[PDB]
Structure formats: C-alpha cells, structure tokens
Amino acid sequence: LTEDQKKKKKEIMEQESLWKNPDFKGYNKTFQELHQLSKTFANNQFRLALSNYQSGVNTIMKNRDWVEQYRKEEAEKKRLDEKWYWQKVDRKAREERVVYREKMKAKQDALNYFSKAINHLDEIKNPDLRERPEFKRLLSDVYRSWIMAEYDLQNLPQTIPILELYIEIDDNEKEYPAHKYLASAYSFEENMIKKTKGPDDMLFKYRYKKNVHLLRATELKYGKDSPEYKHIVNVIN
Amino acid sequence: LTEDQKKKKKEIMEQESLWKNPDFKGYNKTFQELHQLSKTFANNQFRLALSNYQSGVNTIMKNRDWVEQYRKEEAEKKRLDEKWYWQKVDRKAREERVVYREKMKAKQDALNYFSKAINHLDEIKNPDLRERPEFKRLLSDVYRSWIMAEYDLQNLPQTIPILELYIEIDDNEKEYPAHKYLASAYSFEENMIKKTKGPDDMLFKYRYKKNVHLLRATELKYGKDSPEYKHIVNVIN
Amino acid sequence: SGKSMADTEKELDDNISEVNKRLRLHTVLFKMLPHKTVLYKGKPSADGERCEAADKQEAQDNTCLHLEVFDFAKFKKMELFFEGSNNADPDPRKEQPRNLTKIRTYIYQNNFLLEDKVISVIADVAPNGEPAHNDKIELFYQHVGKYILSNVENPIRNNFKKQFYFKNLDYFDKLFTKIFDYND
C-alpha cells in the first residue's frame, strides 16, 4: 500500500473504534483523558460540562449492567403456565418490552445530562476558549454519545441535527462512521416519506442527503477514483 | 475461633436477649437493673423518669395478658353461624382488627408514659449527671421499648429517629439488633418511595442508609472481611 | 474523665492502623468502577505529597493510587503512596501488600468541622507504623494552616480521627476494594 492508503486504513480502524459501543476499557480511557484535559483547560464551566457528560455516560453504563442482570433473573425462573408456543412468545415479547422501556428511560436521563453538559459549554462565551482542543474534544464526545444513545433505540430522525452539529466540529466531517450514520438516518426518513405518502420535496431532500453522505463515506474509506467510489457515482449519475 | 470471635458470639446472644420481646422474667430482670441505676443516681427526676417508664412497660405487659384472654374468650364461644368458609374468615377478621386496634391504644398509652420518662430526663440539666451510666442506660431502655412498641405494629418509619438517638448512646452503635432494625425500617421507606413513585433523592437516601446499617450489622455479628461481610461488600457496590 | 479520653484515643489509633493495614493491600490494583468513582494509577511526584497519574495506567512501575470520589462535584480524594516495587507477575490475584509510605486525603464537599474549622487536607506520613502516629498526621485547617494532630488538645484529637480520618480511610478502602473485586 501507498503512504496515503496505509494512513487511511489505520484512520478508518481508529474511527470505527471511536464509535465503538461503550464498555469499561473505553469508559476508563475516555474519562481519564477528559479529566487530564479539564486540568489543562482550568475552566469551571468545562469542568461542570464534563461532570454532567460523565453522569450521562454513567447512566448508559448502569443500564447495560441492569439489562444483563434482568435477562439473567428472568432466564432463571420456572414457567409452569408455558404449555403452548404462543405463551412462550408472549412472555418473550413482555420481557423485551420491559427491557426497551427501561433503556428508553436510561436514554432520557442520559440525554438530560448531555443537554446539561452542552448548556455548561454554552456558557463559555470567549471565542478563544470555544476554539480550545479541550472544548472541541468534550463537545464531540457529548454529541457522539448522544447520537449513539438514540441510534441504539432506532430514534434515527433525532440523530440528524446532532450528527450535523458533530461533523461541523474539528474535521469530524472526515469520519467515515459519521457519514455512514447520517446516510442511514436520511435513508430511514426517505422510507418514512414513501410509507406515509408524504410530500415529494421531502422525499427528494432525504434521498439527496442520503446519497451525498453515502458517496462521502465511500470516498473517505475507499478513496477518490476507487472501484467503489466510481460505482456509487455511476449509480447516482 | 479467635478470642474476639468467641467473645463476639457471647455478646451477639446477649444483644439478641436485650432486644427480646417483653415477658415476665425479662420484666423482673429489667426493673432489678433499672432500679440499680436509681440506687447510685439518687436523683428525683431520674426516679420520676423510671416511674413513668415502668408504667409504660406495665401497659405493654397488661395488654399482652388482655390479648391472650380476648382470643381465649372468642375461641370459647359456640359459633353456630359459621357454616361458610367466609364466615369463619369474617370472625377471624373481627378478632384481628379488635386485637390490633386495642394494641394500638396500648401503644399510645405506653408512648405517652415513655414521652413523660424522657421529659423528666430532660430536666436533668447538669452535664456531669447526663453523662452518667445511670442516665444513659435508662434512656436506652426507654428508647428500646418505644422502638419495639412501634415495630410490633409495623410503624417502621416512626422507629428511625428513636433508633438513631439510641445508637448515639454509650456504645449502643455496636449492637447488631439496632443496625438490623434500622436497615429493615430504611428498607420499608425505600419500598414506600418505589410503591408511591416518590422522589429519587429519597429513594437513594433510604437505600444508602439501609446499606450502611446492613453492612455495619454484618460487620458486628460476623467480623470485617469474613465470607459474610465480603458478600455484602460486593452487593452494596 | 481523662481515662475515657485515653481509651477512646487508643481505639481510634487502632482503628486507623487496621484500615491502613488493609489500604497497603491495594497494590493488587496496579496490574489490574463503583458508581461515581474514578481510579488513576500513578507515581508519587512533585514535593512527595501528591500523586501523578500515569500515561500508562497499567504500567508495572506505578507506586501510587489516586482515587477520586464524585457525588451530587468532586467530594473526596485519596492518594496511597506505597514503599517498594510491584511483583513482576502481571496477574493481580498474586500480588502482595506494600507498607504505605504516606496517605494523603482531601475533603472538598461534605466537610467535617473540628472545633468549627475544616480540615481539608490530612497527610499521614507513617500509616503502617505504630498505631499511635498522631505526630505523623498533618492537618490543613480552613476558616490552610498546618497543625500536627499530636499537638491537638484532647475532646478534639479524638474527634479528628473519629469524625474525619478513620471514616475517610474506611471509605477509600471500601472503594478500592470495590474496584478490585469488579475487575479481579
């Protein structure tokens, strides 16, 4: 591979890791770095924004532990009134509904914390402070976790304004997952217009934006004038 | 076992006896020892405080005698209108509510006397006298009977301020039953918040205090870093 | 009287000793969280009273544990400074205790008052020595001036260990154990 192809391969893997579903090793790495950045930044509103962001991610981590424990406790129950196939499926559907409703509440609490993290960053008014790598790192982490929290629950239309705000920050526009999620969420919205028989202007708006971010994600991962880039361009043209 | 574990086993049994539901042998033993405090103390307000406490305990003891007699008199009635299952349960429901409501009246009369015992101890103003083992043991016995009178009728929230005042006195904090009752009463309050859909701050306050006294009761009876402690350590996390 | 005061101080000296003997065990965390708790691995640094987090948290040469406690803001901090290097073996289930050279704690929130002043910083420079090590405990007082616990009148000295220091030693031994058990 060339120096650009090797660099690109390395970067796509780092970006896929960046958007990895949360776990304990990523949590530890993320917050230890954010606290070191907070000490460098020495800004009380950034400190508060981080305290809230961490509380939001903690809500998510608490839920992941709850879901495993809940499913475990249910698995260990004896079901005496489960003689029929429809009884087994019904009980399964009831389990999934309880899990989804609890995940929905955890998402709502996590987004209230993320909203507070943003409201504190909003209080940093000095343009020299809003341009801080520390400011941009935290703001990117808040939006990324916010996008993922909604994405997991299939709340794709809600991810669009946050993905858009995300890609405007510190070259995030060059991230392949960011364009993949935008393209998928736009695709969902296009399908909503087709299913609900909505207006043509919105059909084409959503289709257009899907194709822009589909092609851009392709360009970023495979490169300009790659068999894959040429293919997507030829489908669009 | 170690010399401390053997000592501990002895002490836990003595503490369980200390919190034993009242009976006639315990009554006699108690008023032997509470009078022993009157002997050294030679204080008219302490004497009055004990006279009122003893009247309160007598209310409790007379009630226990009433409950046996009432249940006896009911059992000895010929129940010719009792040919239905519901009619047998009906007459049972008559018994239980009359007995419980009579115990509720005895509780108030006992607590009016205990309140008077405390009001007389409040009149001992000299700090050299308030720090006397005579003052503290009587105050402990008044609170213990007060806690038990409420506990028996399921008035668990009411037991908290009295248990808390109790454990502050002369190493009462090292009593396993005191922490067991605190943990149980806090558990009740946690469950009340969960059932009535009350505020989260109170949910966590009550849960926290339950776990503190759960852990301390465990530590006191089994020893720190015992298989039994280590278990509670991981659950509280 | 002074007899009860003497016995109370002795019980408190032993209480801080037994927990310091447990705190010296948290070496098991160098080769290795409960809610709102953040652990850093590092080395004694600067003037020897503070712990500097490692770039490499898992590094085998870390000789200090830095633990931050949050609640609803930072409420508490502890720095455990250990004497001696870690065992070469990478498995924490095999690691042994190291006597503490120092324990440094900070209280930021839920501050206790000793004779109406806050001791925000406590610096223990002989945690695994004779339980009676009040002359080795520096107290930083806010109304932060340096006082030595052994020069505190006594109740006062007793209230310091009963209300501030033992409880913090126990809280942190509790948290370090919580982290260990989760990852062990």
DSSP collapsed to 3 states, chain C: CHHHHHHHHHHHHHHHHHHHHHHCCCCCCCCCCCCCEEEEEEEEECCCCEEEECCCCCCCCCCEEEEEEECCCEEEEEEEEECCCCCCCCCHHHCCCCCEEEEEEEECCCCCEECCEEEEEEEECCCCCCCCCHHHEEEEEECCEEEEHHHCCCCCHHHHHHHHHHHHHHHHHHHHHHHHHHHC
Question: Which residue, among A30, A51, A109, would best test binding to C if mutated, counting the most C CBs under 10 Å from its CB?
Answer: A51
B215 to chain C: closest CA residue: C174
Instruction: Compute the distance between CA of residue C18 and CA of residue A99 in angstroms, rounded to an integer.
Output: 44
Instruction: Compute the distance between CA of residue C103 and CA of residue C94 in angstroms, rounded to an integer.
Output: 24
Contact yes or no for A58 and C40 at CB 8 A? no
Could you tell me the end-to-end alpha-carbon distance of chain B, in angstroms, rounded to an integer? 29
Closest Cβ–Cβ partner in C35, C36, C40 for A32:
C40
Asked if B137 contacts B37 with a C-beta cutoff of 8 angstroms, the reply is yes
Contact yes or no for B233 and C174 at CB 8 A? yes
Residue B133 structure tokens: 């083992």
Contacts of B231 in chain C (CB under 8 A): none
Hey, which residues 45-104 in chain A have their CB within 8 Å of chain C? Answer: 51, 54, 58, 62
B212 near C CB under 8 A: no
A225 torsion bin: left (phi>0), alpha (psi -120 to 50), beta (else): left
Contacts of C33 in chain A (CB under 8 A): 28
Instruction: Compute the distance between CA of residue C22 and CA of residue B229 in angstroms, rounded to an integer.
Output: 15
A36 near C CB under 8 A: yes
Instruction: Compute the distance between CA of residue C51 and CA of residue C64 in angstroms, rounded to an integer.
Output: 6
The last residues before gaps in chain A (C-N over 2.5 Å) are none
Asked if C105 contacts C168 with a C-beta cutoff of 8 angstroms, the reply is yes
A31 near C CB under 8 A: yes
What value, to the nearest 5°, has the Cα angle with vertex C169 and ends C164 and C173?
150
Hey, which residues 116-175 in chain A have their CB within 8 Å of chain C? Answer: none
B234 near C CB under 8 A: yes
- Count Cβ atoms within 10 A of the Cβ of residue C36 and give its class: 0-12 exposed, 13-18 middle, 19 or more buried: middle
Asked if C43 contacts C61 with a C-beta cutoff of 8 angstroms, the reply is yes
Q: Tokens 């708006």 sit at which residue?
A: A205
C42 to chain A: closest CA residue: A32
Which chains neighbour B (Cβ–Cβ under 8 Å, 3 or more pairs)? C
Buried/exposed B16-49: b ≥16 CB within 10 Å, e otherwise: eebbeeeeeeeeeebbeebeebbeebebebbebb
What DSSP character marks residue A131?
T
B237 near C CB under 8 A: yes
Instruction: Compute the distance between CA of residue B112 and CA of residue B118 in angstroms, rounded to an integer.
Output: 10
HSE at residue B143, side-chain half, CA atoms within 13 A, is 21
For A158, residues 6+ apart whose C-beta sits below 8 A from its C-beta are: A150
Contacts of C38 in chain A (CB under 8 A): 31-32, 35
Dihedral of the CA atoms A170, A173, A177, A179 (nearest 10)? Answer: 150
Question: Which residue, among C70, C77, C109, would best test binding to A if mutated, counting the most A CBs under 10 Å from its CB?
Answer: C70
Question: Which residue, among C35, C177, C182, would best test binding to B if mutated, counting the most B CBs under 10 Å from its CB?
Answer: C177
Instruction: Compute the distance between CA of residue A193 and CA of residue A50 in angstroms, rounded to an integer.
Output: 38
Question: Which residue, among C75, C178, C179, would best test binding to B if mutated, counting the most B CBs under 10 Å from its CB?
Answer: C178
Instruction: Compute the distance between CA of residue A190 and CA of residue A184 in angstroms, rounded to an integer.
Output: 10
Buried/exposed A75-109: b ≥16 CB within 10 Å, e otherwise: eeeeeeeeeeeeeeeeeeeeeeeebeeebeebbeb
Beta strands per DSSP E along B14-168 = none
Nearest chain B Cα distance for residue C34, angstroms: 6
Instruction: Compute the distance between CA of residue B132 and CA of residue C126 in angstroms, rounded to an integer.
Output: 37
A24 to chain C: closest CA residue: C33
Counting one residue from chain A and one from chain C, the pairs whose CB atoms sit within 8 A come to: 16
Could you tell me the end-to-end alpha-carbon distance of chain C, in angstroms, rounded to an integer? 48
Nearest chain A Cα distance for residue C155, angstroms: 38
Contacts of C57 in chain A (CB under 8 A): 28, 32
Residue B179 structure tokens: 């922490």
Is A206 strand, coil or helix? helix
The one-letter amino acid code at C105 reads: T
C142 torsion bin: left (phi>0), alpha (psi -120 to 50), beta (else): beta
Nearest chain B Cα distance for residue C9, angstroms: 15
Contacts of B216 in chain C (CB under 8 A): none
Residue A223 structure tokens: 């490169």
Q: What is the largest CA-CA distance in chain B?
A: 68
CA B68 to mean position of chain CA atoms: 21
> Could you tell me how many residues make up chain A?
237
Nearest chain B Cα distance for residue C45, angstroms: 31
Contacts of A51 in chain C (CB under 8 A): 70, 73
A35 to chain C: closest CA residue: C38
Closest Cβ–Cβ partner in C33, C57, C73 for A51:
C73
Counting one residue from chain B and one from chain C, the pairs whose CB atoms sit within 8 A come to: 11
Contact yes or no for C34 and B237 at CB 8 A? yes
Contact yes or no for C57 and A35 at CB 8 A? no
- The experimental technique used to determine this model is cryo-EM
